Design a protein around this ligand. Structure first.
Ligand SMILES: O=c1ccn([C@@H]2O[C@H](COP(=O)(O)OP(=O)(O)O)[C@@H](O)[C@H]2O)c(=O)[nH]1
Ligand SMILES: OC[C@H]1CN[C@H](O)[C@@H](O)[C@@H]1O
Ligand SMILES: [Mn+2]
Length: 539
């Protein structure tokens, strides 16, 4: 409970020192805060913000004041009061589950995962967000990348047996060709948009694919039809009917990632937070599954011979092996267990008849109007799981973080692209500008932007997490606890972030599909795909 006016007067007391206007401003504001019983949680937080600002105004005005020590202690009590305000005043979470699949046909694997959530949360409305205008982005990315592969491997033909022509050389040379093909498409998209602003993304994409890659417009229309029909009868919710998002400051960023960068994870990052802000509820990646009942595998001890991650995977594999809720779910990890351990799993699952005995239900959830709750793995916070009440204060802060982060990026990126040079020259101008504009505040953030042009086309490029992903969420939490906006220097520790954790029992994160990233890939996969592309091209 935050100190009252009398308690602060005692802390900041200085014998025979004038009560300065700036000091009385603080005391008045603190007194007002303690008479705000019947005000909203956000109103109370905005008051605590004022009190913090007024306290800073004082310490800045009277630099050598005997009050300053006690006022620095008071600024700490304000932060504790934000957390107490967040933990003790909770409203219901709107019973919505938000999924996103944009850029192409939703796979049966995605639907089968979504259906688990539906079966165990019959009291929840389910939105599977799609873009009715952009069903051909994934077909465009795949066509350009496969053509870039063939163009690269052909350039390798003779100097092939040479170990200098490794997987690293392949991806560097292929990137140059992907960039040229990207620029060609973006230039066509813009040309078509000035000629006829009525044309939608899929109109332009399918005409581009007909012109440049001899694709049949009739086949592409059939694919759109089948994809639109499929999502239509799986709780489909059209982005092109989401007016608040379309009229907002983030839609140009969403289309930047959808249309120019072909990064559907980045576009998903921008959409999911808008959905939570405007509607409220819980966002889940299509690779997440419901929480396993805590008591289910209580009786089965984890072998020392197996990692924590291995064990969490085998739990889901066990369920799917014996209940077959998701057809052709892997048993790769379960099948490595000793027969006695496999038997323990079978015997437990044989004693369960209903899915509600395997997976838990979200039920009535409540959160602070201040907060967006976020999922955790061993590496820290991850936006694959998000809970927020409609129009939460943090949902607003996170939108503003993403918008500010893209402003800094585009400011350095757009000049470089406008010079209309090759990938290396463009990369060089971009990084020069990044390092030029970097300061003490945004230094760390700027050092992560360098690979933006390569996202999805080159191994171990994770730029998106700094722009639209987890780092935006960490920054938004810092904004809340520091009574400010626009944090770039993240100094929060685990203990701070853990106040915003989603309970581990609400999501099963260790799924088969979670282990296969859709927008990034590591060295292991790079090496593997290179060899796969080589034997395919020369047989
Ligand atoms: O073609 C795509 C690829 C990805 N996504 C979205 O991107 C999210 C994150 O993808 P993934 O789980 O592969 O990211 P990771 O967990 O590997 O960071 C998914 O849940 C989808 O909402 C999409 O809509 N279309
Ligand atoms: O921010 C980009 C991705 C980071 N990993 C998350 O699981 C995924 O949901 C995001 O799209
Ligand atoms: Mn994932």
């Amino acid at each position: 409970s935050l100190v009252n006016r009398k308690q602060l007067e005692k802390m900041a007391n200085v014998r025979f020192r004038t009560q300065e206007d700036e000091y009385v401003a603080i005391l008045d504001a603190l007194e007002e805060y303690h008479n705000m019983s019947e005000n909203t949680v956000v109103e109370k937080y905005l008051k605590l913000k004022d009190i913090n600002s007024l306290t800073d105004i004082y310490i800045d005005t009277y630099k050598k004041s005997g009050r300053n020590k006690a006022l620095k202690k008071f600024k700490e009590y304000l932060v504790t009061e934000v957390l107490e305000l967040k933990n003790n005043n909770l409203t219901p979470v709107e019973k919505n589950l938000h999924f996103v699949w944009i850029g192409g046909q939703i796979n049966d694997t995605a639907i089968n995962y979504i259906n688990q959530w539906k079966d165990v949360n019959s009291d929840y409305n389910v939105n599977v967000f799609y873009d009715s205008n952009a069903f051909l982005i994934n077909t465009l990315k795949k066509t350009v990348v496969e053509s870039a592969i063939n163009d690269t491997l052909e350039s390798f033909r003779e100097n092939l047996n040479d170990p200098r022509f490794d997987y690293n050389k392949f991806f560097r040379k292929r990137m140059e060709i992907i960039y040229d093909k990207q620029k060609n498409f973006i230039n066509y998209y813009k040309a078509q948009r000035e000629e006829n602003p009525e044309l939608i993304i899929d109109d332009i994409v399918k005409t581009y694919l007909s012109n440049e890659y001899s694709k049949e417009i009739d086949e592409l229309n059939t694919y759109i039809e089948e994809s639109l029909n499929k999502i239509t009868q799986n709780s489909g919710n059209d982005v092109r009917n989401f007016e608040e998002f379309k009229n907002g400051e983030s839609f140009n960023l969403y289309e930047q990632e959808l249309v120019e960068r072909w990064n559907l994870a980045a576009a998903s990052d921008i959409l999911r937070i808008s959905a939570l802000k405007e509607i409220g509820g819980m966002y889940l990646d299509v690779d997440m599954l419901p929480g396993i009942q805590p008591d289910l595998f209580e009786s089965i001890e984890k072998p020392s011979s197996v990692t924590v991650d291995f064990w969490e995977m085998t739990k889901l594999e066990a369920i799917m092996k014996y209940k077959e809720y998701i057809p052709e779910y892997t048993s790769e990890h379960f099948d490595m267990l000793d027969e006695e351990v496999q038997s323990s799993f079978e015997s437990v699952l044989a004693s369960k008849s209903d899915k509600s005995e395997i997976f838990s239900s979200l039920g009535d959830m409540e959160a602070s109007p201040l907060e967006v709750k976020i999922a955790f793995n061993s590496k820290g916070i991850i936006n694959q799981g998000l809970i927020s009440v409609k129009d939460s204060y943090c949902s607003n802060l996170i939108v503003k973080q993403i918008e500010n982060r893209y402003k800094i990026l585009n400011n350095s990126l757009n000049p470089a692209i406008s010079e209309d040079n090759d990938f290396n020259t463009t990369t060089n101008t971009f990084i020069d500008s990044i390092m030029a504009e970097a300061n003490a505040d945004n230094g760390r953030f700027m050092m992560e932007l360098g690979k933006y042009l390569r996202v999805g086309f080159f191994p171990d490029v994770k730029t998106t997490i700094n722009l639209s992903g987890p780092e935006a969420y960490a920054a938004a939490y810092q904004d809340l606890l520091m009574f400010k906006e626009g944090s770039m220097n993240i100094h929060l520790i685990e203990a701070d972030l853990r106040n915003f954790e989603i309970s581990k029992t609400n999501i099963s994160q260790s799924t088969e599909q979670e282990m296969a990233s859709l927008w990034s890939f590591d060295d292991a996969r790079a090496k593997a795909q290179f060899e796969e592309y080589k034997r395919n091209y020369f047989e």
